[PDB]
Design a protein around this motif. Structure first.
Motif, short mmCIF file in Angstrom:
data_model
loop_
_atom_site.label_atom_id
_atom_site.label_comp_id
_atom_site.label_asym_id
_atom_site.label_seq_id
_atom_site.Cartn_x
_atom_site.Cartn_y
_atom_site.Cartn_z
N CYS A 1 24.55 44.54 -84.30
CA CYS A 1 24.65 45.41 -83.52
C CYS A 1 26.19 46.05 -83.53
CB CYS A 1 24.62 45.03 -82.05
SG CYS A 1 25.22 46.18 -80.78
N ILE B 1 27.40 48.21 -81.88
CA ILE B 1 28.36 48.36 -80.70
C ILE B 1 29.25 47.43 -80.33
CG2 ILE B 1 28.10 49.14 -78.33
CD1 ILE B 1 24.88 49.31 -80.49
N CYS B 2 28.71 46.23 -80.18
CA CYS B 2 29.49 44.98 -79.84
C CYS B 2 29.66 43.91 -80.99
CB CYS B 2 29.02 44.20 -78.72
SG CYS B 2 27.30 43.33 -78.84
N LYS C 1 26.85 42.15 -82.24
CA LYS C 1 25.97 41.27 -81.94
C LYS C 1 24.86 41.18 -82.96
CE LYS C 1 23.28 38.60 -78.68
NZ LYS C 1 23.57 38.89 -77.32
N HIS D 1 18.36 45.24 -77.83
CA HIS D 1 19.62 45.12 -77.76
C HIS D 1 20.56 46.33 -77.97
CE1 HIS D 1 23.61 42.99 -78.11
NE2 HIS D 1 24.04 43.95 -78.60
N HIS E 1 23.02 49.30 -75.26
CA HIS E 1 24.29 50.13 -75.56
C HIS E 1 23.75 51.71 -75.55
CE1 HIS E 1 26.63 46.76 -76.54
NE2 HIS E 1 25.46 46.22 -77.19
ZN LIG Z 1 25.59 44.97 -78.66
#
Ligand SMILES: [Zn+2]
Length: 33
Positions: free
Chosen positions: A9, A11-12, A14, A27, A31
């Motif tokens: 991921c 975004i974070c 993950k 997931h 986001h």
């Molecule tokens: Zn994420």
């Protein structure tokens, strides 16, 4: 190149297994909200 055997991921940060395409898409989808 290390064979796409896992999704990550952006975004974070993950990361999950390649078989977790359901959680990887879901997931990121979160986001996306
Ligand atoms: Zn994420």
């Amino acid at each position: 190149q290390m064979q796409p055997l896992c999704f990550n991921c952006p975004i974070c940060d993950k990361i999950f297994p390649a078989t977790e395409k359901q959680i990887f898409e879901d997931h990121v989808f979160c986001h996306s909200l």
